[PDB]
Amino acid sequence: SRVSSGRDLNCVPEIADTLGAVAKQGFDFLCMPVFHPRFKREFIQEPAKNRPGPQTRSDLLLSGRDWNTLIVGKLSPWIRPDSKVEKIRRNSEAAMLQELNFGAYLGLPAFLLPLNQEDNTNLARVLTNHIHTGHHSSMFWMRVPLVAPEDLRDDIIENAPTTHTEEYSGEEKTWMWWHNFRTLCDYSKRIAVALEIGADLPSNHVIDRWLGEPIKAAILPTSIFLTNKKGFPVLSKMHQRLIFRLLKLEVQFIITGTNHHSEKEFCSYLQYLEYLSQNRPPPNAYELFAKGYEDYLQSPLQPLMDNLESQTYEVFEKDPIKYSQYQQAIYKCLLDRVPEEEKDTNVQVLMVLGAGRGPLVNASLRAAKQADRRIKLYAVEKNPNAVVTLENWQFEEWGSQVTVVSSDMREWVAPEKADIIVSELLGSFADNELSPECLDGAQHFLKDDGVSIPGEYTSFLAPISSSKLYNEVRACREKDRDPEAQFEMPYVVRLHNFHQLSAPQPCFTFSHPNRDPMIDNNRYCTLEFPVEVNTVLHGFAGYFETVLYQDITLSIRPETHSPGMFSWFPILFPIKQPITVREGQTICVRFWRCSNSKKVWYEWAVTAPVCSAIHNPTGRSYTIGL
Amino acid sequence: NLPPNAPACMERQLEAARYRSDGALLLGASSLSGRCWAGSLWLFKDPCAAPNEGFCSAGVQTEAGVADLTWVGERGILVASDSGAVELWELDENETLIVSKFCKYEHDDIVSTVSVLSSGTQAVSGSKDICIKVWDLAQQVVLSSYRAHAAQVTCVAASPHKDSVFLSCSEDNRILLWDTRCPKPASQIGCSAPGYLPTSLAWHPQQSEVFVFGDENGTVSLVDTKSTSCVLSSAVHSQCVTGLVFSPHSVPFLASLSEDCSLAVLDSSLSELFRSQAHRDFVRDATWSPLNHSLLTTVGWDHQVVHHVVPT
Ligand SMILES: C[C@@]1(O)[C@@H]([C@H](O)c2ccc(Cl)c(Cl)c2)O[C@@H](n2ccc3c(N)ncnc32)[C@@H]1O
């Protein structure tokens, strides 16, 4: 899709003509006043109170259709609910409600309010009161700048110079303006950011603060555009990065200010964004497919407790790299176990534990052929619906090379012990589908010298900031359960609008076979995450790595991600209350793997720089069925 | 009724009222409500005939509203648009038509304030875009563009007799004394950080280093640059002080406008001489008759043109 772009005016003599001119220039929508910006109104004191005549222009000037889709409202700039003058507060209160109520009456899709100072406490109270007056879905775009106007004023007051001191926290102040406002409004999903970009960008850390924030719009003033020698409006290299980053967040671009390039038409600016949009670093395979699932929360699959649907098998079978790596792992293992001299006399007992619909059974055969070794194959599957697929394959193609077993691998009595067990029982947090317990129960029919593929897997955690995902989780409250349960359970999610606060670190590791006597799959692990920014912690992203055999690995840990396995999204472990983290501080998190005879689960707590409640105690909110 | 190629009907909201040297009356007006939000300029060689569009010397429509205007000498009218344009209109030789000479879209938001400098060949504009611009009225260009302020520029006032000096004031709570001769042109004046936002400015016509400023809380204040922090003030109005205009008198009187819809007239101790509840909406300008220094003409958004006779 091409870039969505709107025009920002603070002057509209005729709506009809203005919208037409703006539409003709190529804009998707118009931001404009709904009352005249200079039309101050009195609500208390006579005679100004009783000013006759219409308070603004009629709704009959546009179709309902146009109002709903083409028009973003703007708060009149005289409305200052946090003025130090009582009379001005009371008038700005009434005027804000008036203008906000008219926006709702028109059915406007969005409405712009500025954060242009530190104290917007009364502004927030009035907006909050408006949000809680009817069940409307209309959006509120908080116009807030990257750089506070005070911090980008020309240094031309002789007796009041611009501070040349670096202020790490001071340069981030406009983020705090936003954070305080959205905190006061209790994270309303209807309140998002319109981030105003200035001529001089701040440090990256300041731009990095807005990672994970709900940016719906970016405002580009005409002024910040440099000029091409030909005359077209253009943007600095640094500005072009921010734009590329913002395109990934599919924000709507607003263009504000008068045309500073006289000889050129206004559509010139717009055409540059579209040009910039056409030319972007190419998206990889797991950036292209994962499109549609961005920050979409899902329940992690439990293929032990539940029988996967035909179409679930299908999705996760469409991954040639997974099978090619499994094929290669078995290939290398067969040669190490059967010398070239014994190839024709020595048949290896290979057993696929959780054989699904067959493709791993196929992979095991492709491996034995290209290795030129003979294999007796057992296909063990508990899902009787997939066992239907296997037994149809077994009869039509595989022949008596493959014995299909319709059984739990923990219950199955084997006719003969195995040389290689091959399993595909990993989830996004590795052990979250209960591979450990499954293979432990199957271990007794692996030969004393037998190989497990996979041999080990390791889970990884990283702390993340995402006010967006926090709000997604918050919105998963269901009737008839603990009202905070949604925070005490992991989600599979293509983490999109977020910030990784620290490099992933290993959490839980399992080895197969587990020769260890008196096996215990329970775990307690303390992780310390050095954080080098100011930020807010909303949860922990989970990933994993597995060694199938020797150097043959699969990974969704970003810094070692296998080429593909795009279908395997990260896990999100949320926390009930966001925790403020200052630069230089350590985030300490504690993860537990817990169990009884019936269920496995995770508990977790943050212990630095403050303590959370322990999440999911006793698996009250979330368990994985044995 | 003789409307000589001018709009049939004049917009409700009168922003500007300015007498020329000869005693003819310039009116600026905008529509702040209804279908169309535009403006008009009017010349009334009969002060007492206004606001009636029919007994009109000259009149024209501007594309957008009239936030501020002022005379450029005798023929010229400089206009602060909502469009972000500063535009110069000047009367034809007959003074029956009003023709646009230049319209320059240089400000990124509404132009809120404009003032002609002492020479009359330069002018300074202020805008909600937070910028202040110095204009060459000869070449129709911005010579200088200053982002000194952190919020909307409320009011700019050119020095009576110095082509390089002017006051500005903004919602960032700064009053800047400018001097385009200094390499850092602006200088902040006034100490209190919690002092109410400055809304209006007038240079004293005699004492070229004294001025008055009105705050958003109705207080009018008398400032000497040399005296600096030492000040005289009076709580004149109950709402914002919109405008301050000194009389042409020898020892002059101070007209003060307000959104409380009243006019005041004060001496140089800021004691109250005259009062007027005449207006039923906001009072937007005051202009003293050159011909009779006793007369004082105010316009409001009530669309009244009230001629006051000051007791003096
Ligand atoms: C989904 C399964 O088919 C399969 C595995 O999870 C799998 C295979 C292929 C694909 Cl594409 C996907 Cl997505 C998932 O393992 C089976 N399973 C689990 C536990 C268990 C047991 N204890 N005894 C026997 N089979 C078992 C499940 O039913």
Residue numbers in the entry:
A (entry chain A): 12 to 637
B (entry chain B): 18 to 329
The authors write:
Protein arginine methyltransferase 5 (PRMT5) is an arginine methyltransferase which utilizes the methyl donor S-adenosylmethionine (SAM) to symmetrically methylate arginine residues on a variety of proteins. PRMT5-dependent symmetric di-methyl arginine (SDMA) mark is essential for spliceosome assembly and normal splicing. Several preclinical studies have demonstrated that PRMT5 inhibition results in synthetic lethality with splicing factor mutant leukemia cells.
Here we describe the discovery and characterization of PRT543, an oral potent, selective inhibitor of PRMT5, in preclinical studies as well as a phase I dose-escalation/expansion trial in patients with relapsed/refractory (R/R) myeloid neoplasms (NCT03886831). PRT543 is a nucleoside analog inhibitor that binds the SAM pocket of PRMT5. We solved the co-crystal structure of the PRMT5/MEP50 complex with PRT543 at resolution of 2.5 Å. The dichloride phenyl ring of PRT543 displaces F327 and forms a unique π-π interaction with Y324 in the α1 helix, which is specific for PRMT5. As a result, PRT543 is highly selective against a wide array of 37 methyltransferases. PRT543 potently reduced the methyltransferase activity of the PRMT5/MEP50 complex in vitro. PRT543 was a SAM- and MTA-competitive and substrate-uncompetitive inhibitor of PRMT5, with a slow off rate and a long residence time indicative of a slow binding inhibitor. Treatment with PRT543 showed a dose-dependent reduction of symmetrically dimethylated SmD3, a core splicing factor and PRMT5 substrate. PRT543 robustly inhibited cell proliferation in a broad panel of cancer cell lines and tumor growth in AML xenograft models. We also present the crystal structure and functional characterization of PRT543 and demonstrate that it exerts its anti-tumor effect as a SAM and MTA-competitive and substrate-uncompetitive inhibitor.
